[PDB]
Design a protein around this ligand. Sequence first.
Ligand code: NDP
Lengths: 355, 89, 94, 123, 185, 341
Amino acid sequence: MNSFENLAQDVNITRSGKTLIAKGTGGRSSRTGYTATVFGANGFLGSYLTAKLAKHGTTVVVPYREEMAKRHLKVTGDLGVVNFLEMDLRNLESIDEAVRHSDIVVNLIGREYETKNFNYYDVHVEGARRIAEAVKKHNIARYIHVSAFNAEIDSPSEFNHTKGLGEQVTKDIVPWATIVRPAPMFGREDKWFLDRMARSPCLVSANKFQETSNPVHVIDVAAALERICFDDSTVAQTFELYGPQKFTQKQIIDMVSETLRKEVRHIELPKALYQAYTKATQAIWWPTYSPDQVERQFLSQKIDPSAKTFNDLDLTPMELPDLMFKLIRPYRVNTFQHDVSQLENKEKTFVHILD
Amino acid sequence: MFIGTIILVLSFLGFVFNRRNIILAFICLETMLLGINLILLRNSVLFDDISGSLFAIVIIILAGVESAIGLSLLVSYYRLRGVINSYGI
Amino acid sequence: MNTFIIFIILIPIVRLAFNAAFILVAILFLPFDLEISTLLPYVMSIYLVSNYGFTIVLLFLLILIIGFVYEINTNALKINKHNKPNTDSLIYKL
Amino acid sequence: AIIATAFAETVKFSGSKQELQKRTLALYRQFLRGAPTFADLYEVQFSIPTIRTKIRQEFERHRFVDDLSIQNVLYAKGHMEYQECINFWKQQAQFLKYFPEEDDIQGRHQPSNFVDKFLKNRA
Amino acid sequence: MMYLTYYFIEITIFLAILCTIFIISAKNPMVSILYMIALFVIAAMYLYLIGLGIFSLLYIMIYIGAIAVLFLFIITLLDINSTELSVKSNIRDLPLVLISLIVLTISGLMIYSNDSILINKLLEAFGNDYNTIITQDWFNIENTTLLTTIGNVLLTNNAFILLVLAIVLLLGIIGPISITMKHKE
Amino acid sequence: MIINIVEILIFLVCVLFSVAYLTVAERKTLAYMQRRLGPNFVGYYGLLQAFADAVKLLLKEIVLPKESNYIILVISPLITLITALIGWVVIPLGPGITLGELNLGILFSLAIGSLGVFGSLLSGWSSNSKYSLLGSIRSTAQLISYELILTSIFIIIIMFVSSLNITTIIETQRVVWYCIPLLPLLLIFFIASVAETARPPFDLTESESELVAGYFTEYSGSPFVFFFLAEYSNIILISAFNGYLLLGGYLSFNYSYLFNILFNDYSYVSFLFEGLINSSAYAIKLVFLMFSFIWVRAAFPRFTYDNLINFCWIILLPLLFGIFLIIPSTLYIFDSFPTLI
Ligand SMILES: NC(=O)C1=CN([C@@H]2O[C@H](COP(=O)(O)OP(=O)(O)OC[C@H]3O[C@@H](n4cnc5c(N)ncnc54)[C@H](OP(=O)(O)O)[C@@H]3O)[C@@H](O)[C@H]2O)C=CC1
């Protein structure tokens, strides 16, 4: 039979005064009782999260803006489990609707770039404040913000500045808020890491490929958010999900090139020129690197040692050099067989040309 | 007179210094014949003569038949061996 | 700048086995193509070569028809099947 | 006549344990020699040694079976699976049915003592 | 405007050089055949430049249309292994490549002249300096072109070569059959 | 060189729009032969279906398989379109109303119909998988085997008129169209035309590969669109070769007595009404033969590669190398060898 691998018990009780009795063995038909809300399930991390939540029958409310990106989530659970709402941070009633009946809330909002309708401030600060005020009004028992690694309130990067302001506002309205701080995530169809090193015609670094970091598999961060949504010990806490092994950019690129058996192209042209070329590419409608991210190329990962980690959740986070084979074998060209010699004499026995 | 001599020389050199395969040898033969025909047709124009163009059309015929026979011979080699390796004839 | 000259630039810029009939068809396309292309000068000089070059091209075509005859009666282009239907007779020793 | 496929063995029930010993050993040998093919044909995310480990486990499963007819049945079923795998009939899912372990740890609480099973109503 | 079309022949010379180097350096031979097609096209261009478009078209419909179709028709069906251009394997030929290049070029250029002193035989080849006047006469009455002339001489004055090319083509039929087709029955 | 630009754009617009609506004409003609209708819902009687199939395919992803080439699958359809289009230059719609107006127009078309094969040749190399490289070989052997038969007809009729100028070949057909003395060549030329375009009943590879996982033209996006503007244009082009070789091209009823009766002078109206009449004869002929491509498609079943190569090299070629002997003899019997003009 199947199992409720996520739950430690069957009768759980939220901090809002709801009783949640589990039903079943933990398969597609089961129900965990819980009702959550994930504000970015359409994206890279939230997709894996809703998959792990709805595999066990947890009701999942998924706010969307594009109707067509989401459809790949309805597969993740039985009927009635995954529920969709059209929402926008510029409409408040939509946010109250999404969070009303929820025991858990999960904020994954945030672009790696600015737009015409949303600057970094409006999406990482004001959006967090709107959600927090609604999480507070309705007194939702749990709130699980995700704010980027290296976040610091004042910093050369505006992204990390906002991400730090989003932290303090959430925690200054919702005191029981949990905050996670993942490091650069990697996996299949990642944004800016392996699909780029494997597809992009040429890389560039305003520094050298020297920015140091601890990357991590995204499935494990999704496992972490699962092991935090249900553990009530994690209120008014902070996490640093970074990973065992420290990797410079050039190290990752060399492993990528080795596994791919193709020579990745890197250039290493200076800062102001790349910063200008990025600025001019922000006028075309599709996402591209933005002036504030080449700024983060000079900002290596400072880890906060006062915050919890994977080992506080009984997790064993994975290593990049093992997983790169699984993640890059599709782009492996595999030109041909090695050393065809000592095969002429064997081929000579077969009929190659029929008449 | 220039272009033909150049294609001819470079193709002879790539025929002689080919340590790789054989299709380059076939190609270099065809390019040598091309360069010959260009030399000859340039001279036939400058002299306003026809014997050059006659020998040119004859070269085209003979070169096509050459490639036909060569590519049957290769097919015989392949019949027996199954692989045309880089350094076999 | 002619309209042909304007057009002829604008348009572009805006493991296994085989049967030997598969290969013979290409290898034989060469000489028959060279025959039909060598026939062009005749059709464009047919008057000036009146009744002499006529007979010459006929002996040309007849010589080429000989090779076509050899090709047909060999049955080169035919595909040959190996898993034959049995046509022996059923005979029982008594 | 409807002829047999590639790696087909005719079903033949041996009358002795001493012959089936040999046939089983040949099957094990073929599985091991063919494991790299089982890694290439199926897009596998782990080692050839781990495949050989699982094969050894599957053969240790029925190591202590002394009834001859049941052994003949087991050998025939194993040759069926070798024919299914080496010819590219199985797809990835039906093959990785044999490798649950390699997939990521399913959650946190995997009960092993009584009290946890009781809290999860599995006792 | 005038001199925009002055150096087209030099351009074709440079391009033929490029395509030869590319035929020699390419990894997969299929690409080398494509570059051979580029070379036959450049030759057809040059022949149009010097006033023989008929041969340009005969080339495009013979070489490219048949021979190169066949070359791809072969390399598509055969397992022609290779050895990508390298430095450990082919560098050793550089001194001999260079000596052979210089000598063969200078000889192929000196050969075409009848002067007795050697250096002047090459300095005559490098004398491409003067323009050729073209006068207009009125003696040609018909619409005879190069193809008509070729038909006239090939079918009257040189009939024997035609009636021998028929036998060359009979070889082109009959040899490949004998080689490929096993007359076991 | 302004009007040269005007004349190019007119021609390109007319040809491409004719191709787009040949798709719709194929579908509606084939439908009414099948006792159904339509496309008749995407426009005012379906006159916008082709542009809808296009615009859908241009907003579609450009997806390239893992083990494939990119450049070959991209340029090869593009070069196919180009080569198929430049054959339109030598095609006359009036006496000298031609963009090219070359004296070697037949040989230009014949060399470009030889360049056409490379699309099918490079398709199989877009798939490093092994079976596609044999399926392309089947589809190349049909084309190079049938181009011998189309050419041979070009030469047979040029025995009647000793000039490679297309306009001159058409002007000799004032006396009689060359489809009357050489009627069987009309069937042969139309059969071989249908073959060279790989059209039914000669659609062996597209069907044989539609069953298999590959060996077909598994493209997507824009390359689809170019391949379907290069098939439906090679069709008109090969139909045009039939037109100006055998069916009189632009010729029609002598419009001498009419124009004499109605005009009195050579104005810029008579030139227009003349060019209208000529092009209309040329157009209705292309229409009847495009109808015939469709008519044939609706009826006949498919061939197999053995039946097809056997049809060519054992039935058609012997008849033609026979006709190569009967026609020069027929001219020599009667002292009627044509002159060079
Ligand atoms: N992936 C990584 O490497 C790292 C991620 N993070 C953080 O973790 C989170 C992961 O997001 P990621 O996994 O990167 O994939 P995305 O960043 O693409 O997830 C973005 C989500 O936010 C939603 N969203 C963005 N802007 C708005 C907006 N203005 N209004 C409403 N919804 C919006 C998107 O909705 P739609 O898709 O419908 O537009 C999408 O669902 C982000 O908060 C990011 O800052 C931190 C460090 C590294």
